[PDB]
UniProtKB/Swiss-Prot annotation:
Changing residue 143 to E: Enhanced APP binding and amyloid-beta production. It comes from the Eukaryota. Brain. Detected in the cerebellum, hippocampus, olfactory system, piriform and entorhinal cortex, supraoptic nucleus of the hypothalamus, substantia nigra, and other mesencephalic areas. It comes from Rattus norvegicus. Putative function in synaptic vesicle exocytosis by binding to Munc18-1, an essential component of the synaptic vesicle exocytotic machinery. May modulate processing of the amyloid-beta precursor protein (APP) and hence formation of APP-beta. Part of a multimeric complex containing STXBP1 and STX1A. Interacts with STXBP1. Component of the brain-specific heterotrimeric complex (LIN-10-LIN-2-LIN-7 complex) composed of at least APBA1, CASK, and LIN7, which associates with the motor protein KIF17 to transport vesicles along microtubules. Within the complex, interacts (via PDZ domain) with the motor protein KIF17; the interaction is direct and is required for association of KIF17 with the cargo that is to be transported. Binds to the cytoplasmic domain of amyloid protein (APP). Interacts (via PDZ 1 and 2 domains) with FSPB. This is Amyloid-beta A4 precursor protein-binding family A member 1. Composed of an N-terminal domain that binds Munc18-1 and LIN-2/CASK, a middle phosphotyrosine-binding domain (PID/PTB) that mediates binding with the cytoplasmic domain of the amyloid-beta precursor protein, and two C-terminal PDZ domains thought to attach proteins to the plasma membrane. The autoinhibitory helix linker occludes the APP binding site. Residues 138-150 are annotated as: Autoinhibitory helix linker. Residues 5-150 form the PID domain. It is found in: Cytoplasm; Cytoplasm, Perinuclear region; Nucleus.
Length: 150
């Protein structure tokens, strides 16, 4: 076989928004944060390399090759692409009972491939809960809802 364990994409990092809350943010709140982040795109940027594996997503400065963000895959709450834009949201570590959600925005010719690569690295892990129900017995609306709350 020719299994791929990691992939790196060039992209321009446009910046991020951060949301603090006293309870984990709902789906409706996360989608509001994602739209607001996109609506801010005018435009300063940093060239980055975006590394995706089954364990984590890391953003490296392209020029220095030093990490700027390192997110374990299990903390990603949302990934989407629209045109050349990629939006990636992650729950940041906070003391107990405080919550911080970060929404990063990138631009790349490979936006759709990047979002697809993240999405599938994720739902690979999430479906690894055969040892906790058989995903293949959940409808589309059931699995989709699992991903949006769990
Ligand atoms: Cl890794």
């Amino acid at each position: 076989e020719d299994l791929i364990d990691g992939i790196i994409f060039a992209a321009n990092y446009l910046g991020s928004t951060q949301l603090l809350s006293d309870k984990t943010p709902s789906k409706n709140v996360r989608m509001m944060q994602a739209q607001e982040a996109v609506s801010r795109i005018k435009q300063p940027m940093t060239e980055v390399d975006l590394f995706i594996s089954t364990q984590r997503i890391k953003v490296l400065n392209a020029d220095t090759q030093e990490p700027m963000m390192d997110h374990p895959l299990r903390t990603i709450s949302y990934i989407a692409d629209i045109g050349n834009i990629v939006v990636l949201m992650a729950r940041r570590r906070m003391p107990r009972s405080q919550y911080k959600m970060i929404c990063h925005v990138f631009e790349s010719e490979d936006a759709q491939l990047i979002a697809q690569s993240i999405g599938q690295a994720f739902s690979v892990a999430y479906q690894e809960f055969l040892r906790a129900i058989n995903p293949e017995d959940l409808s589309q609306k059931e699995y989709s809802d699992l991903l949006n709350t769990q």
